[PDB]
């Protein structure tokens, strides 16, 4: 489960950059580690 999926965008000297934030809720008996990775094939995100 995921909540508050946010695409925070910073306009900078280096260019534009995306710093999104989101909150997740997991299942039982699963231990997650720092800098683990998730990917959602079903959901698509537009970019230019």
């Amino acid at each position: 489960a995921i909540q508050s999926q946010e695409k925070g965008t910073n306009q900078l000297d280096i260019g534009i950059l995306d710093t999104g934030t989101a909150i997740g809720t997991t299942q039982l008996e699963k231990r997650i580690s720092y800098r683990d990775r998730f990917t959602v094939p079903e959901v698509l995100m537009p970019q230019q």
Partner: protein, 275 residues
Amino acid sequence: AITSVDSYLLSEIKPRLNTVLENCYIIDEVLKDFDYQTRESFKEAFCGKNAQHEVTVGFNFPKFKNNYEAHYLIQLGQGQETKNSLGSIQSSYFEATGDTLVESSTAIREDDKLVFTVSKPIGELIKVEDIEFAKYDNLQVEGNKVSFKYQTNEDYENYNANIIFTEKKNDSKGLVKGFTVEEQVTVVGLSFNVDVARCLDAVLKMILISMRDSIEEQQTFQLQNLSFGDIAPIIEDGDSMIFGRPTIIKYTSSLDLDYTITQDINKLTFKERKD
């Protein structure tokens, strides 16, 4: 001729940088000090004509995204006035002259002379490579070509040479008004891997040295002064930081303008007092 230092950096960097990364031998000389691991990993990535990854360069505050794997970033920086001249005068010229060019040419066989042809009117000649034309050669310029006499130079009908010359525009003599400007410009390499940044900065230092021999640098942009900052995290709001070591480049150049004179005296009449 107001000088846009930022444009000059981009014009010089883009071709020369590609050439340096193209071959491996030069990179080894550049990265001679670095350890084996960092040296080859960088070479595996960017070096060689067959490099999948590539470096990019651009100015600050672009509305698009840059290749943050490896990128050169430039921003204009401060500027200051350092030295003036009386009446703000720099120089006087009898001919409207543009840029100074270097061109290659081959001698051509005329009857009395051997002549080189150039893409534009010669205006002021500066040098032909390793020729000290004597008075008996009677070196002279004509339009877009330079000529010297044939006799006792007959082995040189096929002479292949480089020529340094100036672009002529008009015969309108005029003065120069301007002063010297001490300008600073910032350059920084960007990456999400610190080792790449250090290699990237070192590559930059070399091409700055090579630019010291350039025509534009020798004639227009003089007195380099380089200053390096400390490696810092440029960005922290992301999955990983961006690291880059800023560098500061200083230049001395002239902000010049052309003032044209029309008061050409040609006649001169003497009349004595009636008394």
